[PDB]
RNA sequence: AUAUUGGCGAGAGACCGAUAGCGAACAAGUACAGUGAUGGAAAGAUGAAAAGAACUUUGAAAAGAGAGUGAAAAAGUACGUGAAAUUGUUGAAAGGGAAGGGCAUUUGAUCAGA
RNA sequence: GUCGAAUUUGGGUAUAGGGGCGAAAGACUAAUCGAACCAUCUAGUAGCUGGUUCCUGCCGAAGUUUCCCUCAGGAUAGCAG
RNA sequence: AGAACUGGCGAUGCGGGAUGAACCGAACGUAGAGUUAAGGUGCCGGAAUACACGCUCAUCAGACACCACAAAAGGUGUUAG
RNA sequence: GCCCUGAAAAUGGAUGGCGCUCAAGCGUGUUACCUAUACUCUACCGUCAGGGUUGAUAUGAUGCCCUGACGAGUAGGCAGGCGUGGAGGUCAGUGACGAAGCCUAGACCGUAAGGUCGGGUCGAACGGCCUCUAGUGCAGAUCUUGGUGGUAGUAGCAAAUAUUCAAAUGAGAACUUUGAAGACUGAAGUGGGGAAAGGUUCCACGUCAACAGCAGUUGGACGUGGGUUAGUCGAUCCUAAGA
RNA sequence: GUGAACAGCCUCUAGUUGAUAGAAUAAUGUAGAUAAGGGAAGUCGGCAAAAUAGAUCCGUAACUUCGGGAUAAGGAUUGGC
RNA sequence: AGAACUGGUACGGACAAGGGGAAUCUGACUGUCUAAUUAAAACAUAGCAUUGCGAUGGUCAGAAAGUGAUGUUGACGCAAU
RNA sequence: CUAUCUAGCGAAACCACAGCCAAGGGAACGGGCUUGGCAGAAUCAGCGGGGAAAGAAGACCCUGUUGAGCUUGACUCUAGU
RNA sequence: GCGUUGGAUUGUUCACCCACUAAUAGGGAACGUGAGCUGGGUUUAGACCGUCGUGAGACAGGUUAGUUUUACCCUACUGAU
RNA sequence: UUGGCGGAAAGGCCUUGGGUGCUUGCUGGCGAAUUGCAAUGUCAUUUUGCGUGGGGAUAAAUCAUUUGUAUACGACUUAGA
């Protein structure tokens, strides 16, 4: 409960969340971004596109020097990516959403992602060796994803 | 201080950017000045590079000392055949250039020039040009009044032409078409030649002449990103040198505090538009000539394509340019060849050049036979026939 | 009669209030480091009471969504409050090689006073 | 480079800090050596470097005199409150 | 680099000298009005492409002190003696 | 006198720029005009100075009021105030009908330090005034402790020849198991044992949150257990340098 | 097994197949190589690299402490049957 | 060890495996050291020379000792250069 | 084999604020200031001009009434003899 | 505008000579240019000599040996979206 | 509505005929007030959206696959009913 700021009808919404996933919070968040405001069977079919290469996430702000492709065009970029792990974990969150309207009893063909964010867990703590007999920090940068998808209406 | 020792720069400034080319087919930035006592003709022609050979032909040089000897030369062949008038285009001048005032195209255009409307020709309806050439419905009177307009105006005349690639060995199947500007006097019978010409080929020999000078206009052959060195042709460094040697080792002094634009660096190389002048169109080879690579001191009735094909493009089997040297470019590539800007008489242009041999041994080896006949001569019978 | 940063037992304070106060409010001279002499931390707080979430549902599962307990779950043992740095989403606005600021006013948003 | 003897090496053993050990480089003596490490004296001293935490109001300087083992410091007079 | 007298800067903003510790003007509570300083008034830029008498044409013209340079020697260039 | 020659330096550049030629240049003269925190007048704040007013309802005589002048400032001095922890007194002060804290381009007061109010959050204490007291105010100290960024999904995860097919298991297999194949160590081994050291890492079963810088169903991991059998092998005994 | 050989190289028994992978094949690198003609002109300097190399036979200088120098130098041969 | 035959005159066919010579400076040599920038011509060395000392002694330890090293020694020795 | 692109994993140095120039003046070599030139989102691979780039309170030099290693008929002592 | 060289000796800058050439001009750019190289020199610590110093040690005197680190950021530049 | 001219950025200029409105060229009739003594006292043109009618047209590009005249990645060049 306490999901970060919306502003649709609960009444015609599901609600899903994920915390402490061990997936790129960076990825985590682009692969959100992508499917921000979209139709739930638009964006899941465009999640498997993404997991089979076909079309690819636009990396709009975590993209410092990665890579370029034409996959972004359709998106307007030219930086984007496939990050299978943000990918998969927000497949499991957008089912599990998908389901949690069925149990509620919504129309599952006007189920839009109304909401999705992505924030940072605490970082789990592992050591790296480097020259000269010196350690440094090797963390990984987990995620807390929620989404909510609702009822399009007018 | 000073560069203690003076060598000249290395490479040429006015070739800059080394960028890629925006084209494949590289634009004809000068046509020859019109003189406008002439007849109506093509100051250029579209070809496609196929290949080198090599040539004997005596040298005509009074002074020199192969004076009536003679001379091995290597020679480039382009594929030439005839362009398809298809439109004509009226350039008006203004204080700020010259600017297209209206192009009228012809009513019927071919498959291969529609193609290059279409960046994907198999599943589109084919719908170019369909609602144009309703504009020869009746009595053309739209079609007439353009080019009226063009009459009225347009101070520079320029037809579109395009290629007949289904008539080279080429894959593409995708015609290429270019503006070549229009010479000879009466820029109202300029229109009148290219509304004549509408739908019509034109063929290289009634543009290019043996013994002609001609300036070759290509996109260079691509080598992709590439260091100073072989870029530039800088000094190698020394083997010690610490992070590698094919480089620039200064790149600057500390001021100006940049690095200045005219320093050696690393980038693309090739793909680059050149326009190479004074290249001598040594045949005009036609197709359905048998013995095109003949000559009348060899008689072998042979073509002009190499035992196994041309390497990497085929067989010519139509009009072909042969010219001295070397062109821009590389085999398969869309090549402009145009008129000479000037009228150069310099003893190296206006040599009449009879040609006594044209090599046809193949060019994927060590060739040894110029034809299957002569191979069958000297090789007799073998287990497998012959 | 005098001394007493040790021991045992007591009573207190204009002392400190978890980075403070002894190093240690807690399984602290502990965990851990060093061959060794020695060095030596961090670490308190759900709630009145576990009433610590039966049961349903999606998920391989972790968990989610419900349901429920509770005064409160904006208290769920990753637990009182829950700042800032930093971050996500939404909303608003601006943006030709920084941004920020001063005086004045336009515009938009917002608001007290009679 | 050297590779059958001034050889290489395990274990045991002895030598301990102004001490040892040195086919000698001030080398080595537990990543520490032109004097090891540990704790204490010790919050060592510093004319030298850095920092020194709220507001407003009023007044408002000196780099000059003499003396100093003094010349990056102080005393003294002057200027200031 | 070192002295004398004064005025400054340091310790001081403000208008001017494009810019600048020290020059010019003027020293400062918060505001309003008027007038000015030094400096300016083609446009940047507020303010006369003002008025008046002359001089100068530079194939490196000249254009405000401090201040951001130029000399000897020359020229039927031109002007006045 | 003006102009010209004399008159040569290094990135492209400077009457400030543009540009200006009976000038917008030079010399000179006359007016008009522009504008500084300066001058003049006025208001307000404060400071200083000189005064008036204890004759009553009159509580602020450190008060009220009148008059004039002044106001730059580092180092520094002094004064009047703001705020914090604790203490004596008082308001029979506030408070579970919500104290403190925190958030709040919402409001008010003060030149300011600050003070006050509304809304949200929250849960048990706290404040005004008169005094007392100090471990009492932070932006800096390569400050201390803790936390967090940009760098950045970046550098990189490239020595030791090398992997491949299928099946099984499993939610999930490049990495587990089995089979097949291809290879390597090539007996001075990547084999079989031991000494020092480690200490259960051995083995079985279960099992993947963390760890194995990818993965993982596997493991020297995690959880639970099992396991080391001596008259003859060692120690034990002897002496060595030595203690 | 080859070979003088515990060298290198290949194999048997035994063991392992463990090093994050997939796709491309730009520059510049790291590691390994080749190069016409010239042959140290490079560079402080032949640094680096190249050339030589096993065995058999022939031949072997100055100098010498008579022991060496010496594999001096310089040549020839080598398979299979 | 030799002969005939044989072949794209190849044949230590991979692997493995000295470049050589004429000289100069310097240290005789083998050996040793600056672990982690110096391997050397530096140190050592055999050889040579000098010095002290006959034990109630030379040289050197220890705070002191009824204490030690050389010394289980004795000048062909020990100690110091 | 990297670099490159991808899946997974994922640091560090450094960081007043930042990042286009020319001249000017200025602590006499500006990213900011003045006057000009100019100036269009977001970017990828390279690169070594610049950031008087980073690394370290300059090891050279000087100063300190700060040391230490070493030496000597420095001053003052001392074990031993 | 355009070019202004190849070498012997030397770390050398400089110099000098050989030689070609149209000519072998002078200079700047942090005495341009070391996260471009190299490291011969200078300029740590090893060592030798000469002179000097009683000595430790000194020497614009000679000699030999002596670790050359980091870019992935911003800009600039080269290319590329 | 007729015809013509205008391409430098024409996008406008001229012209024909009829219709229709106004005419302040001249002479009358009626209206206006209270916006309260002023308050721009709203009269312009810039885009966009929606609705009502009417006319008109009936595609491409990208991804994915493919090519190699291209290429680090993007990009480029090709092919595919
Ligand atoms: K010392
Ligand atoms: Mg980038
Ligand atoms: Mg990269
Ligand atoms: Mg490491
Ligand atoms: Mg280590
Ligand atoms: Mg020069
Ligand atoms: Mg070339
Ligand atoms: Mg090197
Ligand atoms: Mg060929
Ligand atoms: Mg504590
Ligand atoms: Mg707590
Ligand atoms: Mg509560
Ligand atoms: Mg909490
Ligand atoms: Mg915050
Ligand atoms: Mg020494
Ligand atoms: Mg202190
Ligand atoms: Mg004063
Ligand atoms: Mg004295
Ligand atoms: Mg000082
Ligand atoms: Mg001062
Ligand atoms: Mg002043
Ligand atoms: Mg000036
Ligand atoms: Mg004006
Ligand atoms: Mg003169
Ligand atoms: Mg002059
Ligand atoms: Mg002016
Ligand atoms: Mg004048
Ligand atoms: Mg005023
Ligand atoms: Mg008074
Ligand atoms: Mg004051
Ligand atoms: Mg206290
Ligand atoms: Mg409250
Ligand atoms: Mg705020
Ligand atoms: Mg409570
Ligand atoms: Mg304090
Ligand atoms: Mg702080
Ligand atoms: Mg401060
Ligand atoms: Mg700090
Ligand atoms: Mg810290
Ligand atoms: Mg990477
Ligand atoms: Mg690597
Ligand atoms: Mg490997
Ligand atoms: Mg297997
Ligand atoms: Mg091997
Ligand atoms: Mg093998
Ligand atoms: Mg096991
Ligand atoms: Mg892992
Ligand atoms: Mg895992
Ligand atoms: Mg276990
Ligand atoms: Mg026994
Ligand atoms: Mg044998
Ligand atoms: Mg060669
Ligand atoms: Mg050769
Ligand atoms: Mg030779
Ligand atoms: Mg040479
Ligand atoms: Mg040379
Ligand atoms: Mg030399
Ligand atoms: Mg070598
Ligand atoms: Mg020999
Ligand atoms: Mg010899
Ligand atoms: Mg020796
Ligand atoms: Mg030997
Ligand atoms: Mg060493
Ligand atoms: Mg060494
Ligand atoms: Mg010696
Ligand atoms: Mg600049
Ligand atoms: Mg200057
Ligand atoms: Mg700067
Ligand atoms: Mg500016
Ligand atoms: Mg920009
Ligand atoms: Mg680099
Ligand atoms: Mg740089
Ligand atoms: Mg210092
Ligand atoms: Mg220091
Ligand atoms: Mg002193
Ligand atoms: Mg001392
Ligand atoms: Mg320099
Ligand atoms: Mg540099
Ligand atoms: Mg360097
Ligand atoms: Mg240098
Ligand atoms: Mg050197
Ligand atoms: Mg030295
Ligand atoms: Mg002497
Ligand atoms: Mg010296």
Same mark, same amino acid.
């Given at each position: 409960?306490?999901?970060?700021?919306?502003?649709?009808?609960?009444?015609?919404?599901?609600?899903?969340?994920?915390?402490?996933?061990?997936?790129?919070?960076?990825?985590?968040?682009?692969?959100?971004?992508?499917?921000?405001?979209?139709?739930?069977?638009?964006?899941?079919?465009?999640?498997?596109?993404?997991?089979?290469?076909?079309?690819?996430?636009?990396?709009?702000?975590?993209?410092?020097?990665?890579?370029?492709?034409?996959?972004?065009?359709?998106?307007?970029?030219?930086?984007?990516?496939?990050?299978?792990?943000?990918?998969?974990?927000?497949?499991?969150?957008?089912?599990?959403?998908?389901?949690?309207?069925?149990?509620?009893?919504?129309?599952?063909?006007?189920?839009?992602?109304?909401?999705?964010?992505?924030?940072?867990?605490?970082?789990?703590?592992?050591? *790296?060796?480097?020259?000269?007999?010196?350690?440094?920090?090797?963390?990984?940068?987990?995620?807390?994803?929620?989404?909510?998808? *609702?009822?399009?209406?007018? | 201080?000073?560069?203690?020792?003076?060598?000249?720069?290395?490479?040429?400034?006015?070739?800059?950017?080394?960028?890629?080319?925006?084209?494949?087919?590289?634009?004809?930035?000068?046509?020859? +000045?019109?003189?406008?006592?002439?007849?109506?003709?093509?100051?250029?022609?579209?070809?496609?590079?196929?290949?080198?050979?090599?040539?004997?032909?005596?040298?005509?040089?009074?002074?020199?000392?192969?004076?009536?000897? #003679?001379?091995? #030369?290597?020679?480039?062949?382009?594929?030439?055949?005839?362009?398809?008038?298809?439109?004509?285009?009226?350039?008006?001048?203004?204080?700020?250039?010259?600017?297209?005032?209206?192009?009228?195209?012809?009513?019927?255009?071919?498959? #291969?020039?529609?193609?290059?409307?279409?960046?994907?020709?198999?599943?589109?309806?084919?719908?170019?040009?369909?609602?144009?050439?309703?504009?020869?419905?009746?009595?053309?009177?739209?079609?007439?009044?353009?080019?009226?307009?063009?009459?009225?105006?347009?101070?520079?005349?320029?037809?579109?032409?395009?290629?007949?690639?289904?008539?080279?060995?080429?894959?593409?199947?995708?015609?290429?078409?270019?503006?070549?500007?229009?010479?000879?006097?009466?820029?109202?019978?300029?229109?009148?030649?290219?509304?004549?010409?509408?739908?019509?080929?034109?063929?290289?020999?009634?543009?290019?002449?043996?013994? #002609?000078?001609?300036?070759?206009?290509?996109?260079?052959?691509?080598?992709?990103?590439?260091?100073?060195?072989?870029?530039?042709?800088? +000094?190698?460094?020394?083997? +010690?040198?610490?992070?590698?040697?094919?480089?620039?080792?200064?790149?600057?002094?500390?001021?100006?505090?940049?690095?200045?634009?005219?320093?050696?660096?690393?980038?693309?190389?090739?793909?680059?538009?050149?326009?190479?002048?004074?290249?001598?169109?040594?045949?005009?080879?036609?197709?359905?000539?048998?013995?095109?690579?003949?000559?009348?001191?060899?008689?072998?009735?042979?073509?002009?394509?190499?035992?196994?094909?041309?390497?990497?493009?085929?067989?010519?089997?139509?009009?072909?340019?042969?010219?001295?040297?070397?062109?821009?470019?590389?085999?398969?590539?869309?090549?402009?060849?145009?008129?000479?800007?000037?009228?150069?008489?310099?003893?190296?242009?206006?040599?009449?050049?009879?040609?006594?041999?044209?090599?046809?041994?193949?060019?994927?080896?060590?060739?040894?036979?110029?034809?299957?006949?002569?191979?069958?001569?000297?090789?007799?019978?073998?287990? +497998?026939?012959?």
């Amino acid at each position: 409960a306490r999901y970060g700021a919306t502003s649709t009808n609960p009444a015609k919404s599901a609600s899903a969340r994920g915390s402490y996933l061990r997936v790129s919070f960076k990825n985590t968040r682009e692969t959100a971004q992508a499917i921000n405001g979209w139709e739930l069977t638009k964006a899941q079919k465009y999640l498997e596109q993404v997991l089979d290469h076909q079309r690819a996430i636009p990396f709009r702000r975590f993209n410092s020097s990665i890579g370029r492709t034409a996959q972004g065009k359709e998106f307007g970029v030219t930086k984007a990516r496939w990050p299978a792990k943000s990918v998969k974990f927000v497949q499991g969150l957008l089912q599990n959403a998908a389901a949690n309207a069925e149990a509620k009893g919504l129309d599952a063909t006007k189920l839009y992602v109304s909401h999705i964010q992505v924030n940072q867990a605490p970082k789990q703590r592992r050591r *790296t060796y480097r020259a000269h007999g010196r350690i440094n920090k090797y963390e990984s940068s987990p995620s807390h994803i929620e989404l909510v998808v *609702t009822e399009k209406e007018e | 201080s000073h560069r203690k020792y003076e060598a000249p720069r290395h490479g040429h400034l006015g070739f800059l950017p080394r960028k890629r080319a925006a084209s494949i087919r590289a634009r004809v930035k000068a046509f020859p +000045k019109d003189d406008r006592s002439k007849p109506v003709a093509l100051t250029s022609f579209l070809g496609y590079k196929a290949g080198m050979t090599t040539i004997v032909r005596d040298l005509d040089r009074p002074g020199s000392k192969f004076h009536k000897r #003679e001379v091995v #030369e290597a020679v480039t062949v382009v594929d030439t055949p005839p362009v398809v008038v298809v439109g004509v285009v009226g350039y008006v001048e203004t204080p700020r250039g010259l600017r297209s005032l209206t192009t009228v195209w012809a009513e019927h255009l071919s498959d #291969e020039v529609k193609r290059r409307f279409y960046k994907n020709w198999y599943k589109s309806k084919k719908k170019a040009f369909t609602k144009y050439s309703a504009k020869y419905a009746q009595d053309g009177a739209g079609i007439e009044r353009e080019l009226a307009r063009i009459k009225k105006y347009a101070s520079v005349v320029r037809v579109l032409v395009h290629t007949q690639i289904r008539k080279t060995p080429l894959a593409q199947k995708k015609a290429h078409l270019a503006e070549i500007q229009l010479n000879g006097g009466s820029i109202s019978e300029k229109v009148d030649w290219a509304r004549e010409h509408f739908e019509k080929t034109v063929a290289v020999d009634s543009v290019f002449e043996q013994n #002609e000078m001609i300036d070759a206009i290509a996109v260079t052959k691509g080598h992709g990103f590439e260091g100073v060195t072989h870029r530039w042709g800088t +000094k190698k460094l020394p083997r +010690k040198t610490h992070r590698g040697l094919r480089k620039v080792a200064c790149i600057g002094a500390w001021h100006p505090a940049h690095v200045m634009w005219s320093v050696a660096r690393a980038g693309q190389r090739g793909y680059h538009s050149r326009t190479s002048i004074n290249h001598k169109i040594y045949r005009v080879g036609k197709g359905d000539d048998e013995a095109n690579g003949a000559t009348s001191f060899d008689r072998t009735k042979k073509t002009i394509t190499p035992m196994g094909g041309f390497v990497h493009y085929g067989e010519i089997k139509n009009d072909f340019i042969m010219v001295k040297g070397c062109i821009p470019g590389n085999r398969k590539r869309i090549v402009t060849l145009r008129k000479s800007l000037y009228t150069n008489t310099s003893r190296k242009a206006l040599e009449e050049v009879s040609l006594k041999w044209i090599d046809t041994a193949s060019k994927f080896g060590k060739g040894r036979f110029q034809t299957p006949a002569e191979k069958h001569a000297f090789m007799g019978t073998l287990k +497998k026939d012959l």
